[PDB]
Enzyme design. Structure first.
Site, PDB file in Angstrom:
ATOM      1  N   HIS A  16      64.184  45.986  12.746  1.00  0.00           N
ATOM      2  CA  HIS A  16      65.397  45.522  11.949  1.00  0.00           C
ATOM      3  C   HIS A  16      66.605  46.721  12.596  1.00  0.00           C
ATOM      4  O   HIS A  16      67.796  46.349  12.168  1.00  0.00           O
ATOM      5  CB  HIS A  16      65.387  45.732  10.513  1.00  0.00           C
ATOM      6  N   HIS A 130      60.631  48.176   4.172  1.00  0.00           N
ATOM      7  CA  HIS A 130      60.684  46.629   4.273  1.00  0.00           C
ATOM      8  C   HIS A 130      62.154  46.212   4.241  1.00  0.00           C
ATOM      9  O   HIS A 130      63.010  46.854   3.226  1.00  0.00           O
ATOM     10  CB  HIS A 130      60.109  46.145   3.014  1.00  0.00           C
TER      11      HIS A 130
HETATM   12  N1  LIG Z   1      54.035  51.637   0.785  1.00  0.00           N
HETATM   13  C1  LIG Z   1      55.006  50.334   0.538  1.00  0.00           C
HETATM   14  N2  LIG Z   1      55.708  50.135  -0.588  1.00  0.00           N
HETATM   15  C2  LIG Z   1      56.320  49.145  -0.658  1.00  0.00           C
HETATM   16  N3  LIG Z   1      56.521  48.170   0.207  1.00  0.00           N
HETATM   17  C3  LIG Z   1      55.794  48.367   1.370  1.00  0.00           C
HETATM   18  C4  LIG Z   1      54.921  49.708   1.773  1.00  0.00           C
HETATM   19  N4  LIG Z   1      54.164  49.349   2.564  1.00  0.00           N
HETATM   20  C5  LIG Z   1      54.664  48.232   3.336  1.00  0.00           C
HETATM   21  N5  LIG Z   1      55.734  47.768   2.482  1.00  0.00           N
HETATM   22  C6  LIG Z   1      56.294  46.290   2.539  1.00  0.00           C
HETATM   23  O1  LIG Z   1      56.701  45.827   1.365  1.00  0.00           O
HETATM   24  C7  LIG Z   1      56.519  44.360   1.336  1.00  0.00           C
HETATM   25  C8  LIG Z   1      55.950  43.795   0.077  1.00  0.00           C
HETATM   26  O2  LIG Z   1      55.345  44.549  -0.885  1.00  0.00           O
HETATM   27  P1  LIG Z   1      54.917  44.305  -2.279  1.00  0.00           P
HETATM   28  O3  LIG Z   1      56.395  43.796  -3.106  1.00  0.00           O
HETATM   29  O4  LIG Z   1      53.905  45.215  -2.910  1.00  0.00           O
HETATM   30  O5  LIG Z   1      54.406  42.821  -2.073  1.00  0.00           O
HETATM   31  C9  LIG Z   1      55.530  43.832   2.432  1.00  0.00           C
HETATM   32  O6  LIG Z   1      55.849  42.860   2.958  1.00  0.00           O
HETATM   33  C10 LIG Z   1      55.394  45.258   3.264  1.00  0.00           C
HETATM   34  O7  LIG Z   1      56.265  45.020   4.473  1.00  0.00           O
END
Ligand SMILES: Nc1ncnc2c1ncn2[C@@H]1O[C@H](COP(=O)(O)O)[C@@H](O)[C@H]1O
Length: 135
Positions: A16, A130
């Site tokens: 991004h 993200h």
């Molecule tokens: N530690 C993290 N906390 C929050 N989002 C994350 C983290 N690591 C990766 N992501 C990104 O967060 C997105 C959605 O997270 P969630 O809302 O828990 O399903 C994913 O599509 C990942 O790309």
């Protein structure tokens, strides 16, 4: 499906921020070659990594794409962006994927988290992980 050599913040930057060509088809080669899949949609924010990290300092808000999450942050202003749309899927040969490009000025919402302790530079304790929405 993040490649294992990248932290989330580094993968966020790769997808991004670091638009390696102003042309989507060329730029998406990087992302697609890393994740071994042609991404259907990808937004390049014409902004800096540090600018997004300061957006992480904005008031917390619900992630519109991930309703159970409260780790998102809204840009205070619209930013220029290039949005890449898959126009030629090529699953058995990533390199032949082609994209359309749409320029726009919109707000963005990023999820932010504390940095990867081992691999992210100390300089930024809170980092974007993200791109939740452009709005
Ligand atoms: N530690 C993290 N906390 C929050 N989002 C994350 C983290 N690591 C990766 N992501 C990104 O967060 C997105 C959605 O997270 P969630 O809302 O828990 O399903 C994913 O599509 C990942 O790309």
């Amino acid at each position: 499906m993040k490649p294992p050599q990248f932290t989330w913040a580094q993968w966020f930057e790769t997808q991004h921020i670091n638009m390696t060509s102003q042309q989507c088809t060329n730029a998406m080669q990087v992302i697609n070659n890393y994740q071994r899949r042609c991404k259907n949609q990808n937004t390049f924010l014409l902004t800096t990594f540090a600018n997004v990290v300061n957006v992480c300092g904005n008031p917390n808000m619900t992630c519109p794409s991930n309703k159970t999450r409260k780790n998102c942050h809204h840009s205070g202003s619209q930013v220029p962006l290039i949005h890449c749309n898959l126009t030629t899927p090529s699953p058995q040969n990533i390199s032949n994927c082609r994209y359309a490009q749409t320029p726009a000025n919109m707000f963005y919402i990023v999820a932010c988290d504390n940095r990867d302790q081992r691999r992210d530079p100390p300089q930024y304790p809170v980092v974007p992980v993200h791109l939740d929405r452009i709005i």
